[PDB]
Amino acid sequence: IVGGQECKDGECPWQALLINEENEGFCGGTILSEFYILTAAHCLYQAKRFKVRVGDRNTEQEEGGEAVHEVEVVIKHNRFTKETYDFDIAVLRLKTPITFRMNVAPACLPERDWAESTLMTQKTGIVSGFGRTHEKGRQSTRLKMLEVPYVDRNSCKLSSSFIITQNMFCAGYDTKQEDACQGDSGGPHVTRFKDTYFVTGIVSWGEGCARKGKYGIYTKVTAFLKWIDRSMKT
Amino acid sequence: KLCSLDNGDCDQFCHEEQNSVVCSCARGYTLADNGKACIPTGPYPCGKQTLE
Ligand SMILES: Nc1noc2ccc(-n3nc(C(F)(F)F)c4c3C(=O)N(c3ccc(-c5ccccc5CN5CC[C@@H](O)C5)cc3)CC4)cc12
Numbered sequence: 186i187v188g189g190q191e192c193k194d195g196e197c198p199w200q201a202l203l204i205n206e207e208n209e210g211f212c213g214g215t216i217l218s219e220f221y222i223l224t225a226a227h228c229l230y231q232a233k234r235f236k237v238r239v240g241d242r243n244t245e246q247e248e249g250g251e252a253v254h255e256v257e258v259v260i261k262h263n264r265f266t267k268e269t270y271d272f273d274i275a276v277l278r279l280k281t282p283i284t285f286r287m288n289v290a291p292a293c294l295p296e297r298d299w300a301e302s303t304l305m306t307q308k309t310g311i312v313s314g315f316g317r318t319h320e321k322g323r324q325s326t327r328l329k330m331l332e333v334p335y336v337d338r339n340s341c342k343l344s345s346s347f348i349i350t351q352n353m354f355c356a357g358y359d360t361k362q363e364d365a366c367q368g369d370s371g372g373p374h375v376t377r378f379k380d381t382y383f384v385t386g387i388v389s390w391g392e393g394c395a396r397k398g399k400y401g402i403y404t405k406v407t408a409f410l411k412w413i414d415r416s417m418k419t
Numbered sequence: 420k421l422c423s424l425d426n427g428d429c430d431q432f433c434h435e436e437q438n439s440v441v442c443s444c445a446r447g448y449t450l451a452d453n454g455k456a457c458i459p460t461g462p463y464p465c466g467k468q469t470l471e
Contacts (some may be wrong), residue, residue, distance in 0.1 A: 197468075198467075289463075290463040290469050291463075291465040292445075293446075293465040296432050299432045303422075378431070383466060383468035
């Protein structure tokens with residue numbers, strides 16, 4: 186995350202972190218239930234064998250509430266391609282159930298129609314992750330969150346050098362130095378409605394970070410709700 | 420106006436059945452007796468930042 190702030194205690198309880206065999210985070214995820222993580226398909230290429238860490242806010246210290254969970258089943262959307270980055274979505278079934286507690290709890294899956302007309306027509310959403318704090322910087326050791334404006338879809342496609350498909354939406358700022366970044370991929374984009382946070386996006390890709398005239402590209406969760414539902418019975 | 424007016428007074432999901440508001444809730448919540456509010460069934464309902 187570039188700009189924004191640290192998630193304070195209990196603030197971002199649905200954040201998961203995919204860690205490699207060197208125990209370092211390379212991508213984010215969203216907790217959907219005790220067995221299921223939502224992340225991006227392209228993250229599945231960023232490591233050979235990985236696990237999922239939950240409850241972490243500061244990777245430099247063992248705070249006590251952290252838990253690592255082995256991945257039992259990887260479920261990768263078969264339409265994903267690095268050529269296009271379309272269908273950038275995966276669900277992970279964990280071998281052991283996540284125990285919910287301080288800093289560990291699921292984000293809500295919304296209904297499609299309601300989410301589309303009520304959540305994505307709000308001013309902003311919230312993205313979070315342990316990714317780079319500058320386009321050229323290293324990964325954050327602290328969990329961060331940033332409020333990001335929904336971007337008009339026309340403006341979104343004009344600003345992009347790559348084809349923005351119907352499975353994608355834009356969020357962020359034209360010029361201000363706030364954005365997601367490398368390492369935040371796979372993580373939560375959530376939208377708040379009366380103090381309840383619903384998953385609305387998956388951090389996917391972007392032409393660098395916080396750059397003038399460029400926005401963050403997020404996988405549109407509402408276009409995969411049926412698919413997610415099925416993956417959670419698999 | 421229905422769902423378009425202040426989410427039909429629903430806490431969460433709103434849709435219109437036969438020209439009237441029907442509210443419903445995410446998994447882990449129960450619709451309250453007024454048919455609008457959503458009540459958590461456990462200690463860590465989805466979408467809530469953890470305080471307690
Ligand atoms: N702004 C953001 N919101 O979320 C994000 C998540 C990750 C990043 N990111 N950081 C960096 C770094 F500059 F730090 F390296 C990079 C990226 C990032 O995705 N690239 C990127 C750019 C375009 C595509 C893309 C978009 C549409 C279709 C296909 C592709 C892949 N092709 C292979 C060849 C490549 O040119 C295009 C994929 C990744 C850039 C690096 C930014 C954001």
